[PDB]
Write an enzyme that holds these catalytic residues in place. Structure first.
Site, mmCIF file in Angstrom:
data_model
loop_
_atom_site.group_PDB
_atom_site.id
_atom_site.type_symbol
_atom_site.label_atom_id
_atom_site.label_comp_id
_atom_site.label_asym_id
_atom_site.label_seq_id
_atom_site.Cartn_x
_atom_site.Cartn_y
_atom_site.Cartn_z
ATOM 1 N N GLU A 170 12.892 2.786 -4.781
ATOM 2 C CA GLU A 170 14.072 2.598 -5.754
ATOM 3 C C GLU A 170 13.668 1.248 -6.675
ATOM 4 O OE1 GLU A 170 15.931 4.456 -5.791
ATOM 5 O OE2 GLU A 170 15.823 5.755 -3.827
ATOM 6 N N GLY A 248 -9.720 -14.594 -4.572
ATOM 7 C CA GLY A 248 -10.974 -15.106 -3.719
ATOM 8 C C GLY A 248 -11.666 -14.144 -3.018
ATOM 9 N N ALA A 346 -20.954 0.742 15.345
ATOM 10 C CA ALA A 346 -21.596 1.738 16.485
ATOM 11 C C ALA A 346 -21.449 3.130 15.969
ATOM 12 C CB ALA A 346 -21.264 1.522 17.882
HETATM 13 CA CA LIG Z 1 -24.574 2.921 13.517
HETATM 14 CA CA LIG Z 2 -19.756 3.490 12.887
HETATM 15 CA CA LIG Z 3 -10.432 -10.807 -3.933
HETATM 16 ZN ZN LIG Z 4 13.640 8.312 -6.889
#
Ligand SMILES: [Ca+2]
Ligand SMILES: [Ca+2]
Ligand SMILES: [Ca+2]
Ligand SMILES: [Zn+2]
Ligand SMILES: [Ca+2]
Ligand SMILES: [Ca+2]
Ligand SMILES: [Ca+2]
Ligand SMILES: [Ca+2]
Ligand SMILES: [Ca+2]
Ligand SMILES: [Ca+2]
Ligand SMILES: [Ca+2]
Ligand SMILES: [Ca+2]
Ligand SMILES: [Ca+2]
Ligand SMILES: [Ca+2]
Ligand SMILES: [Ca+2]
Ligand SMILES: [Zn+2]
Lengths: 460, 460
Positions: A170, A248, A346
């Site tokens: 909204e 940053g 992993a």
């Molecule tokens: Ca891996």
């Molecule tokens: Ca992975």
């Molecule tokens: Ca940034």
């Molecule tokens: Zn709307």
């Protein structure tokens, strides 16, 4: 070409749009066409047909009203949780467009207001409707937004995600944005079928009425509470981009430093749904806490499948995100033309650095490092693979077959081109992979590897 | 287009080569064609027709000889300064190709040897000749190099630049490199006229017989003592590139950290002549100590005019140099596709960052920051100009005229495209320059400026 390369090829084209395509039988819009469609009312707090112009706006939590411009009645003022969430929604907008929001109180007038209603003009309880708002303008009620206090999601927008989403939506109208198509609640029974273009869904715009599922995404019952990719382009078209936001080194996902709930996952059960805007610095998508197989793309405008959802993360046009970390699942990580650090974690991962000098960590498991072209790792800007495991990981050069099957040579190139050599640097423990490509007079492709690699680890 | 943009346009094409051009009425070779020409003997310490293969070589300062393979006589062993300079020449080769050099003594045989002669086979004093060497091979004298001790430049190669140059040259033959064309001393009276291709000069190869002046360069009487651009490509074709050299942040010129005399200027009277090889890191051309107007190009394969010389610096193929600092003269600094930091210094400078997110300091004087295209400073990777001086420096957008003259707008874009806007961010003291380019649906060009700028500072 291997299925690892194919898997990258296809992921890179996930949710392609515009360019005369048709999706779901509908016309497909580009981000900018969606954005012009969202801003078709041509109205903003700067007036009519004024584009690219910033604004300093005020907002107010009404404490009482003489009347509500829609005719609804039973006014109820915002409670403390609605106030905190509405401020988060406002911040999600000013993060991306050149807007400032300043609260006023007492009798001061305000551009954007917030209030609840509970009954219709007849005085009968309304437990059916949700919310609405009025476009910017000089008329009575312009910019006002109104929410049905009899809906728990509106009373509890901090715990019921559709409430926060509705706030952001909204407020969008109150800044001059429209639904992607001509349709509104109470006006018959519209559906995704009535959509003007394919990308009219929550996946692309929270101004949409249609679920992300209509475009093939899936948020598992959650609602993102912040502007999505086409919303960002739209709001920026009206007010200009905010180049002071997160300039940053920013981390999105786990271990986030954004101080934004919609960019932050604090544990593996958190769902992420966002389109990132970031105006500078070296940034990371940290999706390391999930066990699902994920697909992460760092290209601007692209979508990723994160944390077991589909199409729930995207990167806004005009944004460069540099690094990504996958989780314990079997992931695909796709870099962009920048210098990217990709960490698969992993699981058995596919990493593709693309152009630029990328640094790749497959992590535990059987990882594949994919090269789709000579420009991926030129000598002038070569990739490093920093944790290669001989006899376990693979380097995939099958893409080069398109110009002749690569052959291995032991320690000298013949000059016929299309040859690959591994060279071991005993003093530094580095293996240099050289590729002399067809049509290249000099040897122009090199990937450097921290560790040993065997001929049988290279897929040609 | 302004003369500032034109000055960049032309400098970018300084010494263009290959691609079917003709220069000085001769056929123009690319670096790789020059390199194949230099290696046409097809011989290296790894044998015949063996390319891209590294080698571990030995070298020896002969202390006596039974005979000299050319028939010359009057052997004299190397003195201490010849030994130090010969080692510098060897190092200038192994810096760029995958070679190691290890000294042997006593009776051990060596790939490359050094010795002087002073008389011919007849026993008469020779004060006329200079030096020669023998290609790699299995025959008697292969790899041996010989220098005329009656020439002061050979006795004093540390103070007479042609001596060091001659060392590097003959070692080149001893590693398998040839003159760029069929010609040798004693065999008639060849000249640049007999050159097979235009780039056969000291500007491109120290294996050449011809002065840099034949190609329009000018070293003011100095001799570079290290491999030039085509020498680097040639030696790498035979032995492979050395990717371990200067892989940290390297500075060339003033304040150098190379520990190489030919990359180092210790004061303004030092002449620099080099082609840089650098295998990694964020690197700087520091030419800050000179008062001459200089032209510095960071593109690989390109030449610069440094310290009052012409065509005396180049960057080898396969190398990316990121930063440049000019001197007190009126300089032109041209960046490459990487993120470059360009510092013009005093004087009135022209800086062009090109592609990538560059950071520009004009320094004192009336500087011009030039943009040749929308891709120079996209929103996703925008430039900073960090020391802009209102009413003194200029930002040149005249290149955009090619697609319609840019017009200024005060604070909103009309949508017609080809408009430029300056926006002041009072809170941060930053001016954002936005350019909405023809054909672009969104506003995609931005340069951020640390300081104020006036409309009249922008050249359209
Ligand atoms: Ca891996
Ligand atoms: Ca992975
Ligand atoms: Ca940034
Ligand atoms: Zn709307
Ligand atoms: Ca970034
Ligand atoms: Ca990349
Ligand atoms: Ca692994
Ligand atoms: Ca790469
Ligand atoms: Ca370096
Ligand atoms: Ca570099
Ligand atoms: Ca200067
Ligand atoms: Ca650049
Ligand atoms: Ca200056
Ligand atoms: Ca200046
Ligand atoms: Ca640039
Ligand atoms: Zn010679």
């Amino acid at each position: 070409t291997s299925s690892a390369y194919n898997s990258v090829y296809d992921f890179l084209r996930y949710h392609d749009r515009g360019d005369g395509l048709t999706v779901n039988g509908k016309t497909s819009y580009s981000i900018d066409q969606a954005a012009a469609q969202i801003t078709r009312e041509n109205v903003s707090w700067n007036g009519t047909n004024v584009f690219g112009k910033s604004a300093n706006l005020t907002f107010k939590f009404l404490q009482s009203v003489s009347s509500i411009p829609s005719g609804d009645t039973g006014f109820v003022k915002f409670n403390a949780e609605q106030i905190e969430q509405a401020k988060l929604s406002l911040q999600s907008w000013s993060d991306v467009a050149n807007l400032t929001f300043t609260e006023v109180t007492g009798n001061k007038s305000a551009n954007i207001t917030f209030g609840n209603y509970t009954r219709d003009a007849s005085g009968n309880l309304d437990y059916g409707t949700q919310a609405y708002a009025y476009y910017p303008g000089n008329y009575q009620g312009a910019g006002s937004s109104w929410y049905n206090y009899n809906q728990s999601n509106i009373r509890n927008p901090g715990s019921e995600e559709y409430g926060r989403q509705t706030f952001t939506h909204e407020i969008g109208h109150a800044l001059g944005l429209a639904h992607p198509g001509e349709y509104n609640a109470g006006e018959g029974d519209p559906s995704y079928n009535d959509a003007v273009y394919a990308e009219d869904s929550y996946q692309f715009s929270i101004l949409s009425y249609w679920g992300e599922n209509e475009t093939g995404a899936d948020y598992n019952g959650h609602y993102g509470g912040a502007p999505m990719i086409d919303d960002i382009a739209a709001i920026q078209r009206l007010y200009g981009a905010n180049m002071t936001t997160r300039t940053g080194d920013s981390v999105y996902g786990f271990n986030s430093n954004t101080d934004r709930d919609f960019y932050t996952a604090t544990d593996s059960s958190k769902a992420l749904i966002f389109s990132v805007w970031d105006a500078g610095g070296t940034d990371t998508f940290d999706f390391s806490g999930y066990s699902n197989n994920q697909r992460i793309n760092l290209n601007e405008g692209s979508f990723s499948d994160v944390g077991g959802l589909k199409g729930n993360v995207s990167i806004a046009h005009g944004v460069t995100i540099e690094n990504a970390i996958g989780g314990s699942g079997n992931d695909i990580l796709v870099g962009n033309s920048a210098d990217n650090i990709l960490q698969g974690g992993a699981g058995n991962d596919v990493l593709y650095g693309g152009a630029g000098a990328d640094t790749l960590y497959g992590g535990a498991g059987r990882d594949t490092f994919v090269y789709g072209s000579g420009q991926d790792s030129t000598v002038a800007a070569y990739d490093w693979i920093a944790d290669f495991q001989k006899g376990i990981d693979k380097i995939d050069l099958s893409a080069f077959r398109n110009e002749g099957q690569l052959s291995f040579v032991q320690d000298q190139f013949t000059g016929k081109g299309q040859e690959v050599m591994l060279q071991w640097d005993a003093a530094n423990s580095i293996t240099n992979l050289w590729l002399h490509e067809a049509g290249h007079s000099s040897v122009d492709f090199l990937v450097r590897i921290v560790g040993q690699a065997a001929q049988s680890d290279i897929i040609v």
